């Protein structure tokens, strides 16, 4: 069996740095993607292949992976970070594309 | 009769079980007698018999 | 069988066969 | 412009089928695999299925293997999943997402056999709920 676990929620403070992590047995050695999901809109690509960003995506948006663990990272909290963050972990070659359990960002 | 492409010819066709990797467009058989075609548009695997 | 060719069957089933040589076996035992 | 749009939703008693339809525009539809990923409320998104870019090849999550059936119209620009036995459970807002890397490009023959892992393209959604 496989699934991905995340925490809860984070709190940070508007340009306080902003770890956000997924963790799972063979995360690592797949690539995993993040993507962020205003409430009621669709979920938005925001990391792709563990440290890529897609064009047009705020450079302060930053990722990585390693081992049993990935971390989406955010340089500096804004007020438009109030959303919910999911990753997923991705290999075609598998049919693996399952996401996590998500966590909720809070710009206190 | 049938005509993918250009491969103009006559026969049943049926949905088929092979798979074709992305770069094969029509299959032959033991003989060389073509036997599978690759539909241009839905790009599904049809077996000519 | 694209190429005009039929392969056509034996008149005589190769159940049909057996049993003339089990008639045969059974009459020389 | 890149757009993905759904329809097909409504309320299912549970035991029935209904068939969802995802329209693409705005790119090459026969280039790109397709994926079906549902939200139920107040849940984490959970993957449905996904489909190659000819559809040869299908694979399913343990939730729907068996009861689902993803499959595409590369002609229409469509994508379609045939739902089957509908449970209580599947009530959720289905969304079908392209993904970043193309397979195959059919215009040129380029197949690179090395892709990107992102989905970047994601539609508006359609709602499914099962109950009585
Ligand atoms: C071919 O492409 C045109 C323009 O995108 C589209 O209007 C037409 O429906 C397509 N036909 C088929 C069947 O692929």
């Given at each position: 069996?496989?699934?991905?676990?995340?925490?809860?929620?984070?709190?940070?403070?508007?340009?306080?740095?902003?770890?956000?992590?997924?963790?799972?047995?063979?995360?690592?050695?797949?690539?995993?993607?993040?993507?962020?999901?205003?409430?009621?809109?669709?979920?938005?690509?925001?990391?792709?292949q563990?440290?890529?960003?897609?064009?047009?995506?705020?450079?302060?948006?930053?990722?990585?992976?390693?081992?049993?663990?990935?971390?989406?990272?955010?340089?500096?909290?804004?007020?438009?970070?109030?959303?919910?963050?999911?990753?997923?972990?991705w290999?075609?070659?598998?049919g693996?594309?399952?996401?996590?359990?998500?966590?909720?960002?809070?710009?206190? | 009769?049938?005509?993918?492409?250009?491969?103009?010819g006559?026969?049943?066709?049926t949905?088929?079980?092979?798979?074709?990797?992305?770069?094969?467009?029509?299959?032959?058989?033991?003989?060389?007698?073509?036997?599978?075609?690759?539909?241009?548009?839905?790009?599904?695997?049809?077996?000519i018999? | 069988?694209?190429?005009?060719?039929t392969?056509?069957?034996?008149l005589?089933t190769?159940?049909?066969?057996?049993?003339?040589?089990?008639?045969?076996?059974?009459?020389?035992? | 412009?890149?757009?993905?749009?759904?329809?097909?939703?409504?309320?299912?008693?549970?035991?029935?089928?209904?068939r969802?339809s995802?329209?693409?525009?705005?790119?090459?539809?026969?280039?790109?695999g397709?994926?079906?990923?549902?939200?139920?409320?107040?849940?984490?998104?959970?993957?449905?299925?996904?489909?190659?870019?000819?559809?040869?090849?299908?694979?399913?999550?343990?939730?729907?293997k068996?009861?689902?059936?993803?499959?595409?119209?590369?002609?229409?620009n469509?994508?379609?999943?045939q739902?089957?036995?509908?449970?209580?459970?599947?009530?959720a807002?289905?969304?079908?997402?392209?993904?970043?890397?193309?397979?195959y490009?059919?215009?040129?023959?380029?197949?690179?056999?090395?892709?990107?892992?992102g989905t970047?393209?994601?539609g508006?959604?359609?709602?499914?709920?099962?109950?009585?």
């Amino acid at each position: 069996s496989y699934e991905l676990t995340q925490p809860p929620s984070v709190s940070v403070s508007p340009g306080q740095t902003a770890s956000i992590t997924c963790s799972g047995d063979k995360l690592g050695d797949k690539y995993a993607c993040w993507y962020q999901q205003k409430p009621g809109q669709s979920p938005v690509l925001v990391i792709y292949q563990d440290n890529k960003r897609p064009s047009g995506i705020p450079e302060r948006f930053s990722g990585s992976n390693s081992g049993n663990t990935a971390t989406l990272t955010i340089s500096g909290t804004q007020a438009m970070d109030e959303a919910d963050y999911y990753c997923q972990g991705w290999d075609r070659s598998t049919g693996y594309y399952v996401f996590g359990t998500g966590t909720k960002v809070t710009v206190l | 009769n049938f005509n993918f492409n250009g491969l103009t010819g006559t026969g049943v066709l049926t949905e088929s079980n092979k798979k074709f990797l992305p770069f094969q467009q029509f299959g032959r058989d033991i003989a060389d007698t073509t036997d599978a075609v690759r539909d241009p548009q839905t790009l599904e695997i049809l077996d000519i018999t | 069988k694209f190429n005009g060719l039929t392969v056509l069957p034996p008149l005589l089933t190769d159940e049909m066969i057996a049993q003339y040589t089990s008639a045969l076996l059974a009459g020389t035992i | 412009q890149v757009q993905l749009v759904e329809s097909g939703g409504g309320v299912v008693q549970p035991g029935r089928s209904l068939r969802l339809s995802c329209a693409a525009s705005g790119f090459t539809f026969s280039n790109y695999g397709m994926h079906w990923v549902r939200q139920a409320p107040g849940k984490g998104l959970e993957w449905v299925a996904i489909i190659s870019f000819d559809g040869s090849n299908r694979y399913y999550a343990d939730s729907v293997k068996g009861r689902f059936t993803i499959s595409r119209d590369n002609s229409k620009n469509t994508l379609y999943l045939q739902m089957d036995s509908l449970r209580a459970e599947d009530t959720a807002v289905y969304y079908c997402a392209k993904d970043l890397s193309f397979y195959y490009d059919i215009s040129t023959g380029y197949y690179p056999q090395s892709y990107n892992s992102g989905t970047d393209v994601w539609g508006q959604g359609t709602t499914v709920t099962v109950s009585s």
